[PDB]
Design a binder for these strands. Sequence first.
DNA 1: ATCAGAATCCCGGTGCCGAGGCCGCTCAATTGGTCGTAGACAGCTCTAGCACCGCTTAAACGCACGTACGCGCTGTCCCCCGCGTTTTAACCG
Lengths: 82, 80, 109, 106, 90, 91, 85, 95
Amino acid sequence: VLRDNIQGITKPAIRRLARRGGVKRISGLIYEETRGVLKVFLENVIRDAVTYTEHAKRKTVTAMDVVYALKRQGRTLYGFGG
Amino acid sequence: RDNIQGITKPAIRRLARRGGVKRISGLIYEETRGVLKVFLENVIRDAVTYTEHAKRKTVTAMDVVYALKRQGRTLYGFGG
Amino acid sequence: RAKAKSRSSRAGLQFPVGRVHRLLRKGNYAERVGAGAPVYLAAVLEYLTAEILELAGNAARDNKKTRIIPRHLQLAVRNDEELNKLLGKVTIAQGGVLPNIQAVLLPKK
Amino acid sequence: KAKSRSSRAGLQFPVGRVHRLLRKGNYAERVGAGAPVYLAAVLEYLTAEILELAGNAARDNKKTRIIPRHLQLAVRNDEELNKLLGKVTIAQGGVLPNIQAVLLPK
Amino acid sequence: TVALREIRRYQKSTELLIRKLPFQRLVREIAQDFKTDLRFQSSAVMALQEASEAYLVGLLEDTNLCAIHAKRVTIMPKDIQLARRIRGER
Amino acid sequence: GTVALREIRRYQKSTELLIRKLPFQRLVREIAQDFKTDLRFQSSAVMALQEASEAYLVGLLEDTNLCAIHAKRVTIMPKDIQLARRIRGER
Amino acid sequence: VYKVLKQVHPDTGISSKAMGIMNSFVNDIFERIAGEASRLAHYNKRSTITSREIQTAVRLLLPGELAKHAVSEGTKAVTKYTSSK
Amino acid sequence: RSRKESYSIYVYKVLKQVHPDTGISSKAMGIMNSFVNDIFERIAGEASRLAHYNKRSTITSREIQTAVRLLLPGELAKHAVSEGTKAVTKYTSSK
DNA sequence: ATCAGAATCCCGGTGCCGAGGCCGCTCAATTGGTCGTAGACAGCTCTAGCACCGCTTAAACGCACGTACGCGCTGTCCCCCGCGTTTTAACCG
């Protein structure tokens, strides 16, 4: 289904990366908040990144717009474009 | 000497009595003091350069505002 | 005779457009600036200042004080979660926050 | 032929690339001109520093290839570089190959 | 005992554990839910998934660092809130 | 530790400075000379710097105190500041 | 300045320290918006700050819902400005 | 304009001058290009900020030198300013 | 749960020095014409954007047994809190 995919993002991957991060055990109340705040953060990131692209009368979200949006957010990451 | 004693022990104890910390330690005061020197030195150095570009050798309010805006975490001073 | 008016006022605003327009032109950002854009800036600034002053005044009236002080401004900023999101990078003298104290600070029995 | 400033200035980095910005961007009526060579030199010397640091970091693992993992390792071994980009984290950073006593057995 | 083997193995490899197609689909769905009929680059999706991966691994390293600080390894939601509150984004 | 939370509330309402003229003044003066001698600092600016310093101290100490609550009951340690600083990125 | 505040709240006084605080606040906000608009112009190769530049910067700055209401009010205000005399 | 400008090729030229055998990866190439473009935009923004603030409607050498000093630590920028002042004087004197 | 104690929250009187406000002026805000110039809309090249498919299976999800640890109690000692008193210095002028 191409809707209501909040349950789509998977916790096992976060658990495995935490294991890579040293963590040997996690809890059940953690992901309850972690997933919610992750969804809130993703919503905000997508909103400001697509707001950034709207200036140049473009329809597709470009790499440099996303990188500069994260730069304005203070949580920047570098990649191919930018 | 008096450079490290510019801020007293009960001064940091008051800053802890208004900053959450209920239990303090001797070494904590020294650490917070060193962090304060790092912060103050950064701001004063930025102000020195900015008041050297215009050849003035003294900071105004606006100078302080621009110096602290360079640190990212901006602040709004008096006057302007 | 022509009526030389402030172009913000014709748009229903109060902030004079001349100073910000001069700052834009003299600021080495772009030698050509349109007329509508500083009007939009004036409108946004007026709305934001009016909103923060009204919210601070309501908080101050709740705080049993007739006039505004920076503490009431801090409480007004911390009251709205969106203002904490955006204006969280700036604080004002003698900062404050809602009673988020726990129950582990007091000695246990 | 055509006497460009690259050979005269002895610099491989592009000179008038900044002049493009200054001209078309119309930033001011008095902007750049001398700014190009200055920033080009600063960027060149910073890139030389970063190249040296990355090369030093790469040889620690007896490998002679460059990966952004090693860039993260070199940056995180520098406290000043950390303070420059304290609100930044580079992907694939992971953890260091030195293991603390907390994870190892008795 | 296998934790040591896993640590060495994950230090030797660096594959992106979050997959490009589910996150791409999630981004498409959310973007079309906010503003309908807009396109999204594949490179932007890869950059966004890299940003999210870096954010979560940094957050979990901070969580582990706070855990071992309080002589623990398993952690409670309070640590996550702690990290977000010190970072101030919450 | 129990009257301390009451003192926390008391200093929470307080909205005035503490060490402006005689102290902090001598501090900034000293540091200024250290970098470049014959410097001065506006009184309003002095007040603004002191309030910014004390506000940042309040925030960072609150962060360190909530990190110290994770170590059980109430006690601060140097490692608390160090760890928190590193996590945030200051260290 | 101050005239507007007395119109909306005559019973609230304000010291000059607060007036300077908001003056520095609007100074910083204007500086950030102007810089962001200049960067957006550089990215899309523009030597003239038009309505779209400042509108996009304003929507990027404040959160979505309030930004949308503010730009709607700005649109109705600019239509009033261009239509009246 | 249609030609996709890249800034990693200049780094590649310096690298070939030093160590042409070894090199960088594609993702890493993107990383350094984004770093170069970000630093380029940051120094442009620093020049714009200084020019706005001090009513500096020009930017010859002192302004960008102050921008370099603000961007970078004190000692490294001071040495860079020294060699930059020498270079600009030599360039003006040579012609 | 329940009464007494220390600190705290709001209010009253006074010093004042920075706030509330009047006036000029001058340097800036406005109005008006030019027009080459630079942003908005139709069109060329063509790249990758939305959605799904052949095939294998790594991994997500659900479930079974149990151990390292989550959380709480107990011993300690040392190491910082509570309070009286002195000096000493912060803000005042």
